[PDB]
Design a protein around this ligand. Structure first.
Ligand SMILES: Nc1ncnc2c1ncn2[C@@H]1O[C@H](COP(=O)(O)OP(=O)(O)O)[C@@H](O)[C@H]1O
Ligand SMILES: Nc1ncnc2c1ncn2[C@@H]1O[C@H](COP(=O)(O)OP(=O)(O)O)[C@@H](O)[C@H]1O
Ligand SMILES: [Ca+2]
Ligand SMILES: [Ca+2]
Ligand SMILES: [Ca+2]
Ligand SMILES: [Mg+2]
Ligand SMILES: [Mg+2]
Lengths: 74, 375, 160, 126, 82, 82, 375
């Protein structure tokens, strides 16, 4: 069930990167620290997105190199 | 080309996948639809051995593979392999990501619903196309001939179906779908070759028998006279060189293999041949459009490429039909790709541009949208 | 050895006379200063070893530029030091591949003459156009103005 | 002439390429840091009441879920690209393997040891 | 000692002759090897050319046969039309 | 006498070694010569095959052209009769 | 060299043990695999007489020894002697303790399991290597040629086996192992020399007959013509000097000794020659890879070094095979060490570095680990 696995994994990302978040029972210091955790999570996600963009550019270049090598080797 | 957006006219078929951008004359990439896992052990390390060779790559390494078609009779029996075939077709044979191109699949008449619904669900979820549309394989073959009437006999490799159409109004009660096609002819040829000593068993050698059938077999104008001639003279025995030498000589197996089309009792099928299911399909139509259907009989599909079939079929129908009507059989030289040429023409039309199943529509009604107004 | 050849070459050419004296200490009787099959076989049999003549001919032909089968005095030093192999694995494949990927400034998968000219002018080392032409001949084998990745590997064979 | 100067030029070219690659990588890392710092809206953690803090935390958790979805899509695209480039490398191996394998160099037997044995200390190369 | 001197002389003669024969044989080996490489390359090129020609010829024969059968059928139909 | 006899022994050993070298070289030479003559014959055969294939290709092309002309004539006749 | 760790590519063979570090061109130490106890009494005291001379030392004192090979036909019949040979190979010919080096033994196809299991148990318990791997002697010879397909005929001194391989996928059902090899040719030559008066009986004189076979015998291009020529002229009689004088003259025994390879009926064996077991091994393969195997026939092993065998074998196979296929026989000049060169190449690969049988794995599953995934 690869499609079912994909949908369940997206739901698990929703419920895991954001756990069962009860911010109503935390003190002011805990709320501030959790807000900073969420902000730092945003920062980390953006950093990983930029890393993935770099990897995508590298993959495109290496794919073009492989295409040229295939065309020349024939 | 440039801006704008072109449509992908894919055509799954059963035996050869034909694809290409809309608006051209011939499909860009045509390759057998087989996925073959290796079957032996493999001792060289680092050779870069993959786990499944698909498409035309597995017709060169077929000596150590077990090729298995993912489409049996029109219907799709192995969805993972079909998904693999589609992925290969999009990414390696056309090199266009599907996120930016509409697709126009083709489907045989009278097929199970679940097949079509699963096809659209795959195209919308996995490949994530903008919009896809499914069309009956015979209407396209009628497009390609430039007609607007006529009864088209589309004898593919999986299934032979016979859709009559008049003035653009299809007659749903007169579609005669028969499951004899090129694959059964290959199996029957492989079965009658054993009468001379040549035994082909492996799923790889089925390809060799298919090549023999394509290059040597022909349809006899009169069956009994040919059977008598081949049994006295030796002017028919044509030889053929296997992929390793040891030439073989085919005698009266030449016209006995494709004769199964007109006498399906050879492979044990009950039904009548393709010469009589066309006449039955005509006779179910109304009494006033039978002359036009008689005069515009269209042939399509790969299996109708046998040398001498357009005369045998005309002789048979003229025998069956009333003596006054004129029987004409349209057999264009571009028979094999007729369905795909018609698909390109249909996708290139401006009037058709609003019939696609847009993705938001699928999101609102689910995969069962295909049976709805957007057919 | 070849790096040892570079280190030794930083000294005088009378060291070549000293090398001739050492070669006499080996096999005294030399008359021309060139090493053929016979002298090499004799010295190796004196040492207790025997390389094949085909290997010697391959080693000689790889350095042969004039095509005469012989070596000049500097080429005599080159052939003498080519008798050992210490350039192993050719630096690194991945690092050189990354360098070549960074070289292709227009990212077309090839290295054209303008890119190489720009890189050479940015190097700053004392260079001449003759050396540039020799490098172009050595690198672009088929004279299409472009380097294949396989051609890049061949051009970097045995390079540290 | 001989190949000593050619090898020196080749090594100089490799050094220049390595230095330029290092400088370019450092510049790209700095630009990436600046861009990442500029993208995220800074936190304002002063003068905010309890109810306001809870409302903002809920809104930012919704935003975090949306960003998680976006990054999941980007990761899925990256995974598909990885699979495609691996398949391309496989086809490269298929079309470029066979008789195109480099080989090591062990055919030459020891020579410097014999030189030292039959020359004492007259051989200083090795 | 006299016999030993005679043996030394004949051994020296034999050694010189053998060395010269060996060097001549080595030179001949080199030349013949180069010749063999050249002729093998020529044969490979001829073989590939012949293979390509044979494939093209087979395809053309198939096409000619097909069109010829088509013409024969058409002419028979024309006679029936008469 | 003893010293000269030792020298004679060394000379004999070197002589037989050179003899072995010469014999091996002669073996290589004759083998490669036979290889060369065989490859020459193979090249002649391949060239003959290529010539035959080229002739077949030419004749098939000409016959195809003739059949195409006949097809055009036949289609004209057929439409006229229609 | 320096840090790091190099692999020991040993190759037991049967007749010559070839060993050396991975990554070189030629084996470092090649010496006969014979262990000979002295047989006479011995009267000198304090001469330092050992109880068993192994390797190349027993080919110089063979006048008073009884040499006996520890490997009969691929299989090992005397484990103590084989252990002694391995100990000598590691400690005196290479001088590297086995505690710090992986080993890569080689084994003929279709050999008894117990032989392989005992080999790995010895290597792990007595010599205590870090990791050892056993490879089939033909795949290595295919590595050395730089190919990836082809059918390799590895006619060693113990056993001749013929393993066909395509695209890296070995065909286990087409391996034809025949037990005629160099040793039987030595015995047959020693048996036909008696027709002129020369009698060799002692196990030491078998070495002299082996030297005669190596230096004089050659394979005839056509057997009957050579038999007729040698019986009329005298241009073939080549003389040879025994280790004590009394030169001998070999007549038509020259090409009759190695002819046994193509007619094993000479030594009473039923099977067909090496010219027909290759064709049979090919015909068992699939119909689509026979052309490639025909074009890439590889020779290896010591016994295929007879002058004129690469032409006789090609003539025979061309007679058997269909006339259209091209028959080519690859006979590299480095035939004798082809298996070891291939072994060095395989051990030097990075992809292969995780296939070794690590010692902890052996401790967990016992010696029967070799038949498992780590083959
Ligand atoms: N030139 C030919 N002569 C005879 N039979 C053919 C020829 N070409 C194709 N065929 C048969 O037709 C089949 C291909 O039919 P095709 O139209 O590709 O099926 P599909 O409708 O699935 O695309 C092949 O399996 C083959 O058996
Ligand atoms: N130059 C040669 N000519 C003929 N026969 C040879 C030659 N060299 C070796 N042999 C035969 O081959 C045998 C050695 O084969 P080898 O490849 O060492 O066996 P293994 O596979 O056990 O290593 C010897 O016993 C000898 O009979
Ligand atoms: Ca020179
Ligand atoms: Ca460039
Ligand atoms: Ca180039
Ligand atoms: Mg179809
Ligand atoms: Mg062996």
């Amino acid at each position: 069930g690869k499609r079912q696995t994909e949908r369940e994994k997206k739901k698990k990302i929703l419920a895991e990167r954001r756990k069962v978040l009860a911010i109503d029972h935390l003190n002011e210091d805990q709320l501030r620290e959790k807000a900073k955790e969420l902000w730092q999570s945003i920062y980390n996600l953006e950093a990983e997105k930029f890393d993935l963009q770099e990897k995508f550019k590298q993959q495109k270049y290496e794919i073009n190199v492989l295409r040229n090598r295939i065309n020349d080797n024939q | 080309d440039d801006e704008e957006t072109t449509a992908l006219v894919c055509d799954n078929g059963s035996g050869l996948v034909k694809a290409g951008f809309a608006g051209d004359d011939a499909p860009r990439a045509v390759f057998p639809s087989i996925v073959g896992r290796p079957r032996h052990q493999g001792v060289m390390v680092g050779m870069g051995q993959k786990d499944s060779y698909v498409g035309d790559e597995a017709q060169s390494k077929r000596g150590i593979l077990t090729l298995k078609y993912p489409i049996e009779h029109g219907i799709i029996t192995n969805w993972d392999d079909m998904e693999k075939i589609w992925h290969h077709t999009f990414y390696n044979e056309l090199r266009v990501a599907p996120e930016e191109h509409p697709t126009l699949l083709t489907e045989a008449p009278l097929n199970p619903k679940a097949n079509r619904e699963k096809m659209t669900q795959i195209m919308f979820e996995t490949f994530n196309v903008p919009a896809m549309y499914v069309a009956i394989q015979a209407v396209l073959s009628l497009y390609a001939s430039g007609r607007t009437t006529g009864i088209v006999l589309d004898s593919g490799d999986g299934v032979t179906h016979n859709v009559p159409i008049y003035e653009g109004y299809a007659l749903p009660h007169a579609i005669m779908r028969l499951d004899l096609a090129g694959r059964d002819l290959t199996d029957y040829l492989m079965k009658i070759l054993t009468e001379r000593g040549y035994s082909f068993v492996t799923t790889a050698e089925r390809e060799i028998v298919r090549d023999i059938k394509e290059k040597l077999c022909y349809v006899a104008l009169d069956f009994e006279n040919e059977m008598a001639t081949a049994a006295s003279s030796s002017s028919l025995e044509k030889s053929y060189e296997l992929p390793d030498g040891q030439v073989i000589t085919i005698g009266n197996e030449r016209f006995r293999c494709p004769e199964t089309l007109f006498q399906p009792s050879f492979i044990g099928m009950e039904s009548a041949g393709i010469h009589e299911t066309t006449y039955n399909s005509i006779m179910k139509c109304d009494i006033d459009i039978r002359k036009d259907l008689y005069a515009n009989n269209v042939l399509s599909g790969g299996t109708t490429m046998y040398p001498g079939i357009a005369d045998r079929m005309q002789k048979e129908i003229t025998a069956l039909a009333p003596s006054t009507m004129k029987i004409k059989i349209i057999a264009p030289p571009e028979r094999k790709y007729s369905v795909w040429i018609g698909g390109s023409i249909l996708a290139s039309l401006s009037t058709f541009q609003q019939m696609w199943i847009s993705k938001q529509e699928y999101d609102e009604a689910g995969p069962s949208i295909v049976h709805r107004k957007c057919f | 050895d070849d790096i040892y050849k570079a280190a030794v070459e930083q000294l005088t050419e009378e060291q070549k006379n000293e090398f001739k004296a050492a070669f006499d200490i080996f096999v005294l009787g030399a008359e021309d200063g060139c090493i053929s099959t016979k002298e090499l076989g004799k010295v190796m049999r004196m040492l207790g070893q025997n390389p094949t003549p085909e290997e010697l001919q391959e080693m000689i032909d790889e350095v042969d530029e004039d095509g005469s089968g012989t070596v000049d005095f500097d080429e005599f030093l080159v052939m003498m030091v080519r008798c050992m192999k210490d350039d192993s694995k050719g630096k690194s494949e991945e690092e050189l591949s990354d360098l070549f990927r960074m070289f292709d400034k227009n990212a077309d998968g090839y290295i054209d003459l303008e890119e190489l000219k720009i890189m050479l002018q940015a190097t700053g080392e004392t260079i001449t156009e003759d050396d540039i032409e020799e490098l172009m001949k050595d690198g672009d084998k088929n004279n299409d103005g472009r380097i294949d990745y396989d051609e890049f590997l061949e051009f970097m064979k045995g390079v540290e | 002439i001989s190949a000593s100067r050619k090898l020196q030029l080749k090594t100089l070219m490799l050094q220049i390429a390595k230095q330029e690659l290092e400088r370019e990588a450092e510049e790209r890392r700095g630009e990436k840091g600046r861009a990442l710092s500029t993208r995220c809206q800074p936190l304002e953690l002063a003068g905010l009441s309890f109810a306001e803090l809870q409302d903002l935390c809920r809104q930012l958790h919704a935003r975090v879920d949306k960003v998680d979805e976006e990054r999941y899509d980007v990761e899925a695209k990256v995974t598909k690209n990885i699979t495609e480039i691996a398949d391309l490398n496989q086809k490269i191996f298929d079309l470029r393997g066979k008789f195109k394998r480099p080989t090591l160099r062990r055919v030459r037997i020891s020579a410097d040891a014999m030189m030292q044995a039959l020359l004492g200390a007259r051989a200083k190369e090795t | 000692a006299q016999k030993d001197e005679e043996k030394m002389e004949i051994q020296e003669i034999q050694l010189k002759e053998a060395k010269h024969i060996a060097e001549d044989a080595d030179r001949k080996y080199e030349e013949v090897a180069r010749k063999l490489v050249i002729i093998e390359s020529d044969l490979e090129r001829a073989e590939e050319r012949a293979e390509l020609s044979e494939g093209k010829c087979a395809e053309l024969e198939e096409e000619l046969k097909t069109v010829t059968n088509n013409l024969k059928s058409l002419e028979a139909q024309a006679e029936k039309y008469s």
